[PDB]
Amino acid sequence: AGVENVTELKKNFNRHLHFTLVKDRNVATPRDYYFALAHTVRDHLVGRWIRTQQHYYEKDPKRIYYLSLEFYMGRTLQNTMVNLALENACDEATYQLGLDMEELEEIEEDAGLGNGGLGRLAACFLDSMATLGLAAYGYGIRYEFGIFNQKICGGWQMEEADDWLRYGNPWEKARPEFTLPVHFYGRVEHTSQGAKWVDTQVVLAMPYDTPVPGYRNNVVNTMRLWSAKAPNDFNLKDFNVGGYIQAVLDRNLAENISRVLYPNDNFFEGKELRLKQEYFVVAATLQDIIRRFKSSKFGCRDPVRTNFDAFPDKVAIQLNDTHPSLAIPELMRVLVDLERLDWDKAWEVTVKTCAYTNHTVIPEALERWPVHLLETLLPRHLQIIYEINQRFLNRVAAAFPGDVDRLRRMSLVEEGAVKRINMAHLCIAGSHAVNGVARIHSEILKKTIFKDFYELEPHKFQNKTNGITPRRWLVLCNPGLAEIIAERIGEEYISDLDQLRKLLSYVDDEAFIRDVAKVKQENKLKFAAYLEREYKVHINPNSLFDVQVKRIHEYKRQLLNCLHVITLYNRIKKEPNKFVVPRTVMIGGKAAPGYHMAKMIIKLITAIGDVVNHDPVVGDRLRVIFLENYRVSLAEKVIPAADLSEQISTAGTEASGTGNMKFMLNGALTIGTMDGANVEMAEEAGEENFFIFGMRVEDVDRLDQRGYNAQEYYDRIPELRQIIEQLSSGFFSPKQPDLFKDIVNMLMHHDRFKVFADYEEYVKCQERVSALYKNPREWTRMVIRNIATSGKFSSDRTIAQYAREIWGVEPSRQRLPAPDEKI
Amino acid sequence: AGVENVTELKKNFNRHLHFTLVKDRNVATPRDYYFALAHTVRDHLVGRWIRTQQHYYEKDPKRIYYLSLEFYMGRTLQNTMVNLALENACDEATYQLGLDMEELEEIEEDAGLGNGGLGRLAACFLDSMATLGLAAYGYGIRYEFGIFNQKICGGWQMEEADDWLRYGNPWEKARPEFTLPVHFYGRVEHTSQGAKWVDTQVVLAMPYDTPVPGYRNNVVNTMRLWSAKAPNDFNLKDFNVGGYIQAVLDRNLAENISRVLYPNDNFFEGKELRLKQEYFVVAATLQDIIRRFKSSKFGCRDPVRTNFDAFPDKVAIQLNDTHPSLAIPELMRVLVDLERLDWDKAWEVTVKTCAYTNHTVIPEALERWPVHLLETLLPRHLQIIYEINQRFLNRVAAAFPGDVDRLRRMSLVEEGAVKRINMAHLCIAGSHAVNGVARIHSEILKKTIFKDFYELEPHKFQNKTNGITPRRWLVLCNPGLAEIIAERIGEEYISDLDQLRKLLSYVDDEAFIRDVAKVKQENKLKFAAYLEREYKVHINPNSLFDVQVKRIHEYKRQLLNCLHVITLYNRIKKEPNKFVVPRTVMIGGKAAPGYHMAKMIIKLITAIGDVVNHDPVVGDRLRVIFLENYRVSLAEKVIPAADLSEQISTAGTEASGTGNMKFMLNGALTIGTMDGANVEMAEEAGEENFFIFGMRVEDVDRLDQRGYNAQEYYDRIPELRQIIEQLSSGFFSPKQPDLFKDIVNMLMHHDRFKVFADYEEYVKCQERVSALYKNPREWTRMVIRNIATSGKFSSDRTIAQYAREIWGVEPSRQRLPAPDEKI
Ligand SMILES: *Cc1c(COP(=O)(O)O)cnc(C)c1O
Numbered sequence A, B: 001a002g003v004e005n006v007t008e009l010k011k012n013f014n015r016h017l018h019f020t021l022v023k024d025r026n027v028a029t030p031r032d033y034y035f036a037l038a039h040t041v042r043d044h045l046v047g048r049w050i051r052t053q054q055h056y057y058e059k060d061p062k063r064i065y066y067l068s069l070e071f072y073m074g075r076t077l078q079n080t081m082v083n084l085a086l087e088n089a090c091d092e093a094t095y096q097l098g099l100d101m102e103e104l105e106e107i108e109e110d111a112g113l114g115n116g117g118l119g120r121l122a123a124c125f126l127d128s129m130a131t132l133g134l135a136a137y138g139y140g141i142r143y144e145f146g147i148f149n150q151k152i153c154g155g156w157q158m159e160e161a162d163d164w165l166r167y168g169n170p171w172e173k174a175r176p177e178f179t180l181p182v183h184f185y186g187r188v189e190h191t192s193q194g195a196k197w198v199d200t201q202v203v204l205a206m207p208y209d210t211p212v213p214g215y216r217n218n219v220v221n222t223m224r225l226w227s228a229k230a231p232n233d234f235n236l237k238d239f240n241v242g243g244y245i246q247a248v249l250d251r252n253l254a255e256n257i258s259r260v261l262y263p264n265d266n267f268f269e270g271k272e273l274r275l276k277q278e279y280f281v282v283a284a285t286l287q288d289i290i291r292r293f294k295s296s297k298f299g300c301r302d303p304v305r306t307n308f309d310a311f312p313d314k315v316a317i318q319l320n321d322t323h324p325s326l327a328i329p330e331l332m333r334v335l336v337d338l339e340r341l342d343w344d345k346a347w348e349v350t351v352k353t354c355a356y357t358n359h360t361v362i363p364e365a366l367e368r369w370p371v372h373l374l375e376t377l378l379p380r381h382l383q384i385i386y387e388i389n390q391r392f393l394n395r396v397a398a399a400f401p402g403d404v405d406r407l408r409r410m411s412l413v414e415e416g417a418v419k420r421i422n423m424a425h426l427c428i429a430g431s432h433a434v435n436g437v438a439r440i441h442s443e444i445l446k447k448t449i450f451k452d453f454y455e456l457e458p459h460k461f462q463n464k465t466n467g468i469t470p471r472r473w474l475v476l477c478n479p480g481l482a483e484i485i486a487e488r489i490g491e492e493y494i495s496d497l498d499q500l501r502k503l504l505s506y507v508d509d510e511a512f513i514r515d516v517a518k519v520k521q522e523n524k525l526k527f528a529a530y531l532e533r534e535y536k537v538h539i540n541p542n543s544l545f546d547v548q549v550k551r552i553h554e555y556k557r558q559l560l561n562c563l564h565v566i567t568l569y570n571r572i573k574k575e576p577n578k579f580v581v582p583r584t585v586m587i588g589g590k591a592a593p594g595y596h597m598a599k600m601i602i603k604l605i606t607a608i609g610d611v612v613n614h615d616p617v618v619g620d621r622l623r624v625i626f627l628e629n630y631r632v633s634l635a636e637k638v639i640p641a642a643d644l645s646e647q648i649s650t651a652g653t654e655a656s657g658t659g660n661m662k663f664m665l666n667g668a669l670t671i672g673t674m675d676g677a678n679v680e681m682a683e684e685a686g687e688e689n690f691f692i693f694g695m696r697v698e699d700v701d702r703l704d705q706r707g708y709n710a711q712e713y714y715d716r717i718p719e720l721r722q723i724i725e726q727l728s729s730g731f732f733s734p735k736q737p738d739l740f741k742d743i744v745n746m747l748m749h750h751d752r753f754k755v756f757a758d759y760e761e762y763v764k765c766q767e768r769v770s771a772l773y774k775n776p777r778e779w780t781r782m783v784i785r786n787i788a789t790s791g792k793f794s795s796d797r798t799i800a801q802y803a804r805e806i807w808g809v810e811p812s813r814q815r816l817p818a819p820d821e822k823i
């Protein structure tokens, strides 16, 4: 609240219902009400957005361009209000108008533009870059369809189109006026001055901008996402008859480029359509960059010629994964072919400008494009690429004289009866810095897959542990919590998570301990109920909520959790009159369509729940639930409500993880392996304050050396063995005896993740979990140790690191002056 | 002007530049300026729009639904201001802000949703229906692409996509909340209660509303145009795998329905796509209608059951041409199949509700659908249709006992080795009224093509001469003129064109005569200049501007005009030192892609200009110009600037014409045949006050009886004969001797329009034109007689007639009370 402001907001809300929506109070739906509030908050954002940009114009700082094919933003309304601090007023304002804001918020559809970790990261970054006063821009694609809505039918995932712009998107701003052409196909003509790319087919890239407000600093940066539009004539040009009408219809072909996001996480699919997406983002983006460089305070900058030598002094391009790797030869192409810079000079520039982040070591996720694909779609780019390789291999050669295998190993070109380009090698070669996202990940990169690279240029490899935004991930989703903490230490911690440590002072503090546990129960009650309203639940609120939410994958080992769960059901069924800690096990996440195994997995979960939830001997005791359509908005409701976070990837598979960090801040204890960021988390909180288990990296490696035999486990562990037979015999699929005989085969003959090898220790560590939960006060003190020690995981420390060690910029906590415009 | 209002407008303009466009005065383009003004005017329109609708709700009048596949609206900004009377203020407001409004207006793209006459008519209607206080709604399709932009290249028409929504459309309002399903394909199952339409494929119809403000009466009606959207699941449903991604892409198929307008004028093309368009408009529309009937003050209307007997008392559906003819069986379908009404009862209803307007007698324009097309796409509709026929032919049978040919002649089903449905017969059978658009047209309908029908039910046939809106067509495009007239008789004539007659008093009135001729010259100067700016002109302002603007067609006889023009060039070239009235002959209009002849024609015009404009012996004297991309906005600039309107269709081909009427009001003298509305125009103004010529209907018929032989003309007229040889010999196509040997063939062996048969009289009447022009004062007095006598041609008289003799409603001149909302 605060009366004038409240007077204002009520006024504007009324103005947009009428004017903007063209609706009357006798006809508006909560949906209209939603949109009316959105447009009121949005106004509060314009002057600042305009000012920020104006500011960068004449202030001309180095700019950071964050290129990503994914921006997994979720809802924007709550988050803009938090950031603008309008939350209470909006609340009052809507109270008096009589509306239930929280009810309005649920009407907002998520902006589901990514698949999971990589895209959520990009979204946290932007908020961190904005909160830190950097002149940064996120560039992506405006997909008409984000990641699909996941439906569960008869136990199976059914995918339906995420029609996110149906009702409109109040936060973006079409910028048809800044549409630029993108070229595809054609042929090259090396002639006189040099090479020309001709008889190409053109697609227009049209930008849409979305504001990204920093935490109460009067800063609003931009997220520019391109939309594909077909040119107006070929699409009726050429000698080009064949139907006037059909030619008009044929525009689809072309606009198809930004139609939908490829729904694969940590999986590479060599489809032309994806490659066009990657080229399109990059080509349009680079023009914008160049445009901005040349027109800026250089706007004048008369005579070198037009200088690029200063390029790296004013621009940084960050490659989120190899997705946008084409930015490398695209920058060379332009500099060279269009700007007429000598290779040497341009390469230098490129290097100093580009930086690449690796997100995984899984071989199947790596991008290796068939050259036949490139040759065709981007002939000039393959030429450039061959060129880089040459020059690149001439450098190794010199360094490791005679080392003939190394040459073959580091080549960007994989000759092999399907000659491919390794996108990762192109990226290291063309960038001044390469970082892993977790120190362990970073260490393994340099010890293995990129060993050769490191040896050639140690100086290029860095580490930048990932983070999460305390705004969305604490303040927005768990206000009870932020509150109880604020009471104690106040608020400077929302933009300085580190101060959470002063929290160690209340571990032994009883009013504290009761608050912490109390907010935790409330969250729980709010989740249980939501469960019911929105579906059919009847979940046990005074049960340990054990949640595993992330994309479904073999490496994630939702299966091991599945094993845990049947064991539990099995012990119970064996000695049912015995008291055990009640638990509500929740698992959710999406599987890419066609990742047969991921689909099999979900079904298996549903299968267990079908059995477990209908056993009268089980009672209150065990509940298994598959959480349908997990995405940003769902994560905001379930995370704050959980007690135990399952982060159990086979050590060395999960590069960092971030769901990781979200649970730590909302007070859940973590059960996990020493993989990714869990290593650092445990590190910061103390190993006694985490439920660690299983093999470490060296362990895995030592087993692989031996050769892994699941038969041995099966053979040596009765419990495990019985689960098998039950999976195998139709225990969980009556109708269809052999339904899961597939997971069995895999578990038994080809489990690349050695599920069985960490089973015994996992079940054992889980008992320890249960033991601690029976002692409330003790479970809460530990949790306190987790919350207290989470500040290192804010995306603000992360961004501060990138800024300083790669971008060469300085974050500011400084507030843009910026109210507005009156006269 | 008017100071407070001006203060307001300036304020709001400023508000939207900032807030709505998110632009600053250091960055806005005239385009932004345009959009900022549009959004300010639009606000002035909402309360009235909301109020109007609210008013109809509780006032519950009979509603009129005008169904059309075309709504050729043009620009909306000027027209909303005229209607809201904000024109001066906006002018001031923009003055002081320093902008040149007129310059801003040119930025608005036309809403090119129709092809010519039929669609422009629908647009005039809405304005008339609104000005007359009727509770009327226009229903159509929101095409993403209207009629194509016409480019002329090397003398030929090149068509490019009319990408009208590129930059957005400020006047519409998406209504995603009122999307309804439309069904296609399926099969029928006759069972128990009756027939069911199953296993159909569904497309969603999403409405977009546009306000239609009446002339200063505080009334704003709605234009609702549907957009095709694909359902969210099949488009990923069924067992329906085959690519998750490809399934997503496949949504195009479906949204393809509203992608573009078919660019044929007075031409029927039996393409499935068009039929889907026709079904889609109708199905979505009917639901809205039914919805409105049942929910309205019947909202209560408890027990008959739900009564339809009152249906015709609350609804009128007007079929613009047979395009929407499916409304007939669609209404039966619902009433019958869904509402479970006995056929008899429903038929009765249908009849009393539907009315159909015929727009042409040309056989090639008539819709005759292959039943194989229907059987498939709309199986239940073909069943219904067969049913109507039966019952229908059982009525003739009874009436004309034994008359076996009549039966065959009136059948809705044309058996004939491609069995087709005659859309026109279905329409007469199912409607209580059928009207022609010109009394002559109306008389010929009943004398010929529908002779049988008339004989069966004389009472169904009417006449409703077309009209034009004096708002767009006088006030908006020729303010000088409206002014000079206003000075004399004031303004009640904008909504009572009839008062234009009091104008007879100044014929012999010299200050009048000078005004009239003066505004005419100004208009001329403004056109000539526009010519130059926008292109390359150098047109003779003190020349008789002879214009023929309409769609290119054989029946229109742009060729005869072409003949006129070469003759002139020929006489000149023969006795060049002889004085003649200088003339600038302008011809423009679009040809449907693939109407080879129409394309040939344009080229021929360009061809003549290539020759004529570069003959030094011609000089100032003759100028031939092809006006590229003629459409609503162009008509508004050229009509007011013309001196002679060419309305020269072979008598009996042009049903009415309306370009007809536009020229009469902007003071042009008319050269024409006694065809369509020219008959009535000449009638009202006096035959001595028109340049009439050629054969009348009876004449044509008498020649056809003889058998038409162009050789006879060629043989008997030297002038004509020489033109031939020149066309034939390469006179106008050096490079390509035989280019036009095609038009020649046609002219000579197969001219269905008997161009040659009206050549002599045409050239003769033209001399008379020239004679009068040499006497300014006399040309102006005549013109005065034309303007004075034009009131009958306002769309207001037209709409008043429809209202009273078909809709059974009463127009009102009564002003909605309606300012707004304060507190
Ligand atoms: C944070 C987040 C992720 C990443 O979770 P991990 O457990 O690191 O894989 C995936 N999806 C959503 C919706 C998220 O919020």
Ligand SMILES: *Cc1c(COP(=O)(O)O)cnc(C)c1O
Residues within 6 Å of the ligand: B115, B116, B117, B120, B549, B550, B551, B630, B631, B632, B635, B656, B657, B658, B659, B660, B662
């Ligand atoms: C009025 C009008 C027409 C109809 O002109 P006719 O001469 O009756 O065929 C066609 N096109 C446009 C743009 C119009 O304004």
